[PDB]
A paper describes a structure:
[name] is a major regulator of actin dynamics, with GTP-bound [name] promoting actin assembly via the Scar/[name] complex. [name]-B, its isoform [name]-A and the Scar/[name] complex all possess an evolutionarily conserved [name] binding domain (RBD) termed the DUF1394 domain.
The structure of each [name]-BΔN monomer consists of 12 alpha helices packed into two bundles running perpendicular to each other to produce an L-shape fold. Based on the structural alignment, we define [name]-B DUF1394 domain as a module comprising two helical bundles in an L-shape fold. The asymmetric unit contains two molecules of [name]-BΔN with each monomer “slotting” against the other to form a compact dimer. Thus to test if the [name]-B dimer observed in the asymmetric unit can occur in solution and if it can heterodimerize with [name]-A, we used pulldown assays, which revealed a weak but reproducible interaction between MBP-[name]-A or [name]-B with HA-[name]-B. Overlaying [name]-BΔN:Rac1Q61L complex structure with that of the [name] dimer, we can see that the two directly compete for the same binding interface. This raises the possibility that [name] dimers autoinhibit [name] binding and regulate [name] functionality.
Author numbering:
A (entry chain AAA): 3 to 145, 153 to 299
B (entry chain BBB): 7 to 147, 156 to 299
Write the structure that this text describes.
């Protein structure tokens, strides 16, 4: 255990304990839909405007929290990748370190997908911040969320899967500043994790210690996580017929789950992927995703 | 030529159809909220798409028309600003082009007032574009969509289009003095104020259709002026007299001019200047 690597483990662990609180905040996000729709439709009504404002300021407090955290997560991940791609694989000598770094990467992706699932099912978030930004521009007449931050946040929340796109960008950037390392070291981290996830899902017998909702829910979300990172940073990507990812098998295990459990995860594959809409991707895997 | 005049009346006849389209605009708000919140239930995703395709048909109409309106104005400015003002000789022609200019601005504000009060339009098209990207998976069957998205992100889309269209015309006719354009705007603004301020309580001049016309046109022209005039419309020594202009607005039944005050808040250039009266900001707040 290096001082550098205990610093990354320290850093990421603070980040990951905060991550459950972020999920709490997002889960309890009411939205200001009602207030805004009425305020907008009766713009002379000075009372309906205070209401909409009152309701929106707290929510944009959370939206700022979420976005700021995404920057912390972004950095935490590129931390992990640096550490967890540099030294070769050692099952005998240095396993505890690898297992520990693998654990934290998986836990990042578990949060990431859970956050994005809830975002995609929240009708309010984009409209809330849209109303905020215009009402901010009214109050600035008579005279902190500065303009350029707000433009970044607007784009963040325009994303189907904000957190996951943040992380695919963060992974694309990592390979970029480490052209010295072969691409395989990163791609093989993602591909092994994807494959191990599939094993834990597929290999266990019916009704063993391995087949609890907690395990299945976790492994599905890590799998889809790393599949999509891989799709972005692997030249040929995840959808090519002889890709080490076997997308077809990954989608099939998703299709095997209760519909409402994994519809968020299927949408991530639809929207936040790079190579899905390619002439060279199986019309069968297209078929499955429409 | 006289074709330019004839090209705008066919446009100004279509404009009244566009407005009744926007008035009848259902919106797919509820349908989409449900589809988003139950993304697995394919029935709700069918419902939402069904409701949305017709609305996005209208949204495409409105944007297309904004292109026609845009060129129509640039024509009118061409015709108006090329010739000296003739009070005697060629007045009928002047008044005719002026009236068409005023009628463009009447539509523009009426469209933008309704847009601003329609909570559906932006969300509708947002859902469309997302759901279009799903269907392109299997190729069930771009540039324009990005244009439309920006258009409908504007507080006052039509008026923004005309502000851009006026900035454009000034730009591409540097040979004409800027005053030739800005004096057209400023005189119309001032004539509008006269029609509103001058007549007695009970007169042939005091009817809703006059007041409602003149307030739109006025707000129209002083916003265009603000964009193209170097000093802008808010300067203490401007022939626009902004303060005086806002006063006639504040004198109205608030619900009938709240759209017009929002235009001034959002679609202006010079409101937020260090050198713009605190009294003028006081009034828009």
């Amino acid at each position: 255990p290096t001082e550098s690597e205990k610093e990354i483990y320290n850093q990421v662990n603070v980040v990951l304990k905060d991550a459950e609180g972020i999920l709490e905040d997002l889960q309890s996000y009411r939205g200001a839909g009602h207030e805004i729709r009425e305020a907008i439709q009766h713009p002379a009504d000075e009372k309906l405007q205070e209401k909409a404002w009152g309701a929106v300021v707290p929510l944009v407090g959370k939206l700022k929290k979420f976005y700021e955290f995404s920057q912390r997560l972004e950095a935490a991940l590129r931390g992990l990748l640096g550490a967890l791609t540099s030294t070769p694989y050692s099952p005998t000598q240095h396993l505890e370190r690898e297992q520990a770094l693998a654990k934290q990467f998986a836990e990042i992706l578990h949060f990431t997908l859970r956050f994005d699932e809830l975002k995609m099912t929240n009708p309010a978030i984009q409209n809330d911040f849209s109303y905020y930004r215009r009402t901010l521009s009214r109050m600035r007449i008579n005279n902190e969320v500065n303009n350029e931050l707000a433009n970044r946040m607007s784009l963040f929340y325009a994303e189907a899967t904000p957190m996951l796109k943040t992380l695919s960008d963060a992974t694309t950037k990592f390979v970029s500043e480490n052209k010295n390392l072969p691409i395989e070291n990163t791609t093989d981290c993602l591909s092994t994790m994807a494959s191990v996830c599939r094993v834990m899902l597929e290999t266990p017998e019916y009704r063993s210690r391995f087949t609890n909702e907690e395990t299945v829910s976790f492994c599905l979300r890590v799998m889809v996580g790393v599949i999509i990172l891989y799709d972005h940073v692997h030249p040929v990507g995840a959808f090519a017929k002889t890709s080490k990812i076997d997308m077809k098998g990954c989608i099939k295990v998703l299709k095997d789950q209760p519909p409402n459990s994994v519809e968020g995860l299927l949408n991530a594959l639809r929207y936040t992927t790079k190579h899905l809409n390619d002439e060279t991707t199986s019309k069968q895997i297209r078929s499955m995703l429409q």
